Design a protein around this ligand. Structure first.
Ligand SMILES: Nc1nc2c(ncn2[C@@H]2O[C@@H]3COP(=O)(O)O[C@H]4[C@@H](O)[C@H](n5cnc6c(=O)[nH]c(N)nc65)O[C@@H]4COP(=O)(O)O[C@H]3[C@H]2O)c(=O)[nH]1
Ligand SMILES: Nc1nc2c(ncn2[C@@H]2O[C@@H]3COP(=O)(O)O[C@H]4[C@@H](O)[C@H](n5cnc6c(=O)[nH]c(N)nc65)O[C@@H]4COP(=O)(O)O[C@H]3[C@H]2O)c(=O)[nH]1
Lengths: 793, 41, 45, 144, 144
């Protein structure tokens, strides 16, 4: 029958069709798909001039710029996608006297507050409110592009005016006093939002003015420098994690006559005793194990004799500049009794490891140790955070040592020191790096312990109502304690629209337009103000993910306390149960809402849309939370730190070649050689590292050669070689500061896109494994529709 | 050059760094080799 | 009714209220900036 | 073998057909679908040489001009040739005023907008096949 | 050329067309869809050289100014030229009162917020396609 085709169709087109059909048959594509593709091709080339060289040049780089379209994979409704993408592109764009000064301040402040009260309590019609919204939002946007602290204050005040307006409107004209069911839940949501507003106001106060304390130079004479004792308390950590801490301590740039390093062991392990004997540091193994780490430190204080005590965790390695950058203030302020240093984690956190964003997004704790403690510094409320700190022993002996009551002993002892009149200080430069939690369960547990301790301090010591303590200190401490009571409001927020969608209950009795015109400015201004203030500390919309991960596990213990090596990828079902339950509830709500959009009253058309967008936001948040709960592969014994240093390699025949170190770990290095000079996968190599102008040699064995990249494994080193290696790789006083300074800034829209992709990735992750089999089908359907829509944006 | 990197990164123009490790190594070297001790002092 | 009178005065004036709010924000920011500078200088000494 | 490059389309004459169709839609043209379809077939009919194609275009330019003139309601050129003496006998200022009054700027603006839209849509809309389809539809309407 | 990459868009004239559309919606305009469409086609006419593009913009600026003046309900140039001497000879108080009554702060605020929205859109959503579509819709509605 090929003769008929040859006669009817010109042979070039016939050959093209036959070849395309054969290619799609070999790839499994349907013959009907090939026929439809050819029909579209011919109808286009006759109804669309594809001969234009402009479109040919666009097609030349179309694959690189738009790799989401495949010419060899036809799909139903392809021309609709082409038209939609084309429409998106065409749419898209390609001094004075005291009394007079006080009176002037009084009049200015009262006038400004009267104007703010008028702005807050002015009823509007929707158009007037919208104009007000656009104007104030534009003012915020303009002030955003203005570096400094005055702009931060302006944004704080503007946000406070907007939030006070929102709360005033909610408390005046949203509570519907008609129903007994549309009242209790509405007031519950109102109380949740009032708590959130209070937390926001106290946080704005806390970081209103970071102090930016600077190190004070030490005296030139080395005989005036004070004696420092370093404590390293260990209970069950392996020696491989404390060795680097001890080696970095032995290399601290402090006079060895005035530096004693102690290893505290609550396990009575003989390996630690022998290690202490070999390296020359002290050792204490108490017979009675009471009060845990606080008791260990107290027993150590019973023997140590030094002016200052510096507490280090097992995994935290100090830089050599730590004592020189810290001790200056203790000799300047006689009242000082505590100094704090940031906590940095070179190990990838569970979020960073699982979600694949390690060096892109900032760490969870760099907002606290980067901005919050600096804010607490101004009000003299910088509390002990466990490690990377120095305490003067004379004040610490008066208070009876480290507090032993709560599980968070550091905050308690800092609170006692502040209540006895002593001050505290904070230094911003990261001078010690530790290991992050190895799993989501560990993060949940440590946060639970911290929250339990903070609630215990709130119930027992009660910073609000105690003894001599400044009001700013009270506010800072109560804000830190309230931060851990946010689980219940988060649960309310995640389960609020399900009320109306499931059981008709008007939580907010206002038209959807007015809700959009009042709630939205609050959120927009809060996001902008935080993005300016906590700029290189936390990306936008990420705090909700952490909050929702913690909420279900922090709310029960906090409430009770108020009353009284990944071999294979897997999903932590036990940890992820609450997220899956909330996803099921929200999606059954969205099914009911889809029903109500048609079979419900027509007047409730925008309200259902508002509830549905709320449910969609909830689902994105919970999907990100689930995405956290899948553990990525981890077979590296030691974690690697990406640092670029020039180096050199020495062979046994005496040839030296230059190389660039790209990453280092406890027992290896990774280097890059321009051309793969001379190295094989078992040869011994001497590695030359420079610390300033001094060069150090370390024996290595080659483990992997993959072209330019070479992996090296460290040979058994002596103690001095260990110290030198730590001083050349880990305890460098430039790695952590530049690490924190290299964090990208906060882009709210890009952050939203990343979080949406993360939620989609989490849904796809759960589309593979399923605890309750039934959920499998639903998850697969959701992922299917979601990627179909993504292909049709 | 770590201290130089810190100074270039975050202010710190008046904190003179006292490298006590280098001084202790130099003193031990002067004690160990009498030639260096003779020429230095 | 004085609050009613004040509201009716600016019932449909969003531009004027935006100007007043910006003025209040700038002035309160200046006062807070002065106070926080004073407290910061006293804090570092 | 690039034998397909002998059937290129009617790029350059698509504006002609579009203007004629617009005039027909506006009622200012006496349309002959059969003659237009014959002209389109002649234009789309290939010639062995590119120089022969240029010669065909040069021959069809007077043919296209004559067809456009005759499709309009203007009187035949023979009457103009006969009465040129009488026209010259009339005052020239009155003739200038009359020709300035006769020109309709609305149609000129519409023609300019159509030319711009044809130069732009020659990216997403191949005008040759659409013109052929519209001409076939008009021929079918006039036949049945 | 092969590409004709000269359809750069209306660029700043999107705000001009948006202002015209808003004034027409307010009801203060004697809109001319044909003249607006011709002006838009003139602005979107592809030109090879950038110097010709700049010259076209410079020439179109007073043309657009005159078209905007014509499409309004303000009196024509004859009245202005006849009453300029009287306006100059009038007292300052009457001129100040006339200026105050002529300026509407609501109109100024609407124009400013429209300009800000146009800036935001032109940063994210281009406006040439929307302006052309709106002009075509208005022309079709008026002609039909
Ligand atoms: N035999 C051997 N080969 C090594 C080693 N380190 C790197 N490679 C090789 O280099 C590739 C690039 O890995 P990367 O740059 O570390 O970037 C890695 C890393 O970011 C991540 N990754 C893979 N496995 C692990 C793991 O066990 N732990 C961690 N933390 N990340 C891992 O995935 C990326 C891609 O890794 P691959 O697809 O496996 O491809 C790896 C692998 O072929 C090593 O210690 N031993
Ligand atoms: N900084 C650095 N160190 C390197 C590199 N290559 C090897 N090492 C060091 O050499 C040790 C042995 O690695 P291996 O023999 O390839 O044997 C490796 C390899 O089989 C596997 N592995 C670890 N990470 C990766 C990875 O990213 N990708 C793959 N494909 N395998 C990995 O786990 C084994 C244990 O590796 P580790 O526990 O990391 O212990 C590693 C590490 O200390 C490198 O490119 N960079």
């Amino acid at each position: 029958m090929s003769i008929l085709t040859r006669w009817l169709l010109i042979p070039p087109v016939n050959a093209r069709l036959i070849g395309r059909y054969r290619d799609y048959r070999r790839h499994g594509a349907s013959a009907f798909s090939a026929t439809l593709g050819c029909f579209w091709m011919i109808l286009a080339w006759i109804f669309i001039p594809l001969e234009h060289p402009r479109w040919q040049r666009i097609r030349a780089e179309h694959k690189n710029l738009y790799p989401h379209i495949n010419a060899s994979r036809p799909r139903p409704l392809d021309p609709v996608r082409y038209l939609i993408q084309t429409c998106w592109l065409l749419i898209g764009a390609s001094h004075l006297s005291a009394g007079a000064r006080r009176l002037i301040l009084g009049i200015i402040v009262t006038f400004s507050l009267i104007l703010a009260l008028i702005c807050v309590t002015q009823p509007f019609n929707p158009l007037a409110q919208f104009i007000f919204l656009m104007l104030l939002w534009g003012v915020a946007l303009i002030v955003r592009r203005m570096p400094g602290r005055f702009s931060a204050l302006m944004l704080i005040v503007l946000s406070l005016t907007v939030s006070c307006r929102y709360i005033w409107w909610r408390y005046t004209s949203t509570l519907n006093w008609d129903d007994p069911v549309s009242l209790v839940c509405g007031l519950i949501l109102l109380f949740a939002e009032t708590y959130a507003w209070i937390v926001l106001v106290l946080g704005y106060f806390q970081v209103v003015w970071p102090l930016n304390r600077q190190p004070v130079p030490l005296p030139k004479d080395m005989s005036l420098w004070p004696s420092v004792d370093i404590f390293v308390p260990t209970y069950n950590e392996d020696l491989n994690v404390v060795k680097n801490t001890i080696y970095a301590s032995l290399g601290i740039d402090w006079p060895k006559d005035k530096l004693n390093i102690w290893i505290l062991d609550d396990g009575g392990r003989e390996e630690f005793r022998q290690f202490a004997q070999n390296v020359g540091v002290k050792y204490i193994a108490r017979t009675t194990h009471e009060h845990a780490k606080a008791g260990n430190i107290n027993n150590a204080l019973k023997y140590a004799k030094g002016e200052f005590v510096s507490i280090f965790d097992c995994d935290h390695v100090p830089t050599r500049s730590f004592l020189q950058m810290t001790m200056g203030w203790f000799l300047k302020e006689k009242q000082l009794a505590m100094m704090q240093t940031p906590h940095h984690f070179f190990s990838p956190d569970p979020f960073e490891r699982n979600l694949g964003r390690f060096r892109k997004t900032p760490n969870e704790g760099t907002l606290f140790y980067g901005l919050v403690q600096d804010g607490n510094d101004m009000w003299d409320a910088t509390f002990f955070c466990g490690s990377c700190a120095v305490i003067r022993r004379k004040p610490l002996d008066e208070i009876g040592g480290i507090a032993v009551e709560t599980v968070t002993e550091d905050a308690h002892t800092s609170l006692r020191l502040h209540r006895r009149g002593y001050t505290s200080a904070y230094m911003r430069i990261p001078q010690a790096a530790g290991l992050a939690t190895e799993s989501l369960s560990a993060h949940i547990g440590q946060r639970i312990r911290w929250a339990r301790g903070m609630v215990q301090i709130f119930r027992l010591d009660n910073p609000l109502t105690g003894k001599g303590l400044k009001f700013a200190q009270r506010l800072c401490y109560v804000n830190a304690m309230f931060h851990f009571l946010s689980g219940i409001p988060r649960l309310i927020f995640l389960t609020a629209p399900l009320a109306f969608l499931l059981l008709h209950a008007y939580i907010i009795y206002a038209p959807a337009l007015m809700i959009a015109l009042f709630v939205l400015p609050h959120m927009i201004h809060a996001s902008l103000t935080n993005s300016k203030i906590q700029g290189k500390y936390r990306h936008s919309f990420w705090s909700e993910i952490y909050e929702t991960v913690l909420a279900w596990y922090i709310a029960p213990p906090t409430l009770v306390a108020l009353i009284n090596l990944v071999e294979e990828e897997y999903v932590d079902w036990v940890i992820s149960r609450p997220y899956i339950f909330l996803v099921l509830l929200n999606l059954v709500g969205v099914a009911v809402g889809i029903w109500r959009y048609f079979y419900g009253p027509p007047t409730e058309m925008l309200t259902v849309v508002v509830s549905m967008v709320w449910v969609f936001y909830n689902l994105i948040v919970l999907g990100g939370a689930v995405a956290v709960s899948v553990e990525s592969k981890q077979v590296r014994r030691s974690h690697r730190v990406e640092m670029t240093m020039p180096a050199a390699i020495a062979r046994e025949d005496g040839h030296l070649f230059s190389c660039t170190v790209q990453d280092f770990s406890d027992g290896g290095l990774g280097i890059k050689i321009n051309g793969q000079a001379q190295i094989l996968e078992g040869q011994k190599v001497n590695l030359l590292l420079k610390r300033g102008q001094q060069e150090y040699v370390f024996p290595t064995q080659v483990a992997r050669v993959m072209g330019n990249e070479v992996g090296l494994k460290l040979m058994p080193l002596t103690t001095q070689q260990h110290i030198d290696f730590v001083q050349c790789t880990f305890a460098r006083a430039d790695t952590w500061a530049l690490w924190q300074d290299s964090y990208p800034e906060d882009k709210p829209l890009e952050s939203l896109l990343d979080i949406l992709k993360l939620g989609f990735r989490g849904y796809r992750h759960l589309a593979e494994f399923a605890p309750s089999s039934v959920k499998g089908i639903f998850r697969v359907l959701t992922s299917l529709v979601s990627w179909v829509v993504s292909f049709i944006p | 050059n770590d201290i130089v990197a810190l100074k270039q990164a975050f202010s710190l123009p008046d904190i003179d760094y006292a490298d006590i490790s280098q001084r202790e190594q130099l003193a031990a070297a002067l004690k160990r080799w009498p030639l260096l001790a003779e020429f230095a002092q | 009714p004085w609050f009613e009178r004040l509201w009716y005065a600016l019932a449909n004036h969003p531009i004027l209220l935006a100007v007043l709010a910006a003025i209040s924000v700038i002035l309160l920011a200046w006062v807070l900036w002065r106070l926080l500078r004073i407290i910061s200088r006293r804090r570092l000494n | 073998s690039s034998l397909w490059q002998y059937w290129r389309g009617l790029s350059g004459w698509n504006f002609y057909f579009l203007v004629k169709f617009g005039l027909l839609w506006a009622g200012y043209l006496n349309f002959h679908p059969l003659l237009n379809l014959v002209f389109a077939a002649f234009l789309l009919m290939p010639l062995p040489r590119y120089s022969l194609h240029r010669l065909r275009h040069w021959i069809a330019l007077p043919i296209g001009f004559a067809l456009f003139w005759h499709d309009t309601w203007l009187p035949g050129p023979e009457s103009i040739m006969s009465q040129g003496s009488q026209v010259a006998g009339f005052s020239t200022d009155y003739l200038i005023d009359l020709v300035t009054r006769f020109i309709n700027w609305q149609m000129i603006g519409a023609i300019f907008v159509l030319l711009v839209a044809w130069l732009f849509l020659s990216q997403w809309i191949r005008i040759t096949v659409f013109v052929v389809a519209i001409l076939l539809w008009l021929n079918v309407l006039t036949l049945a």
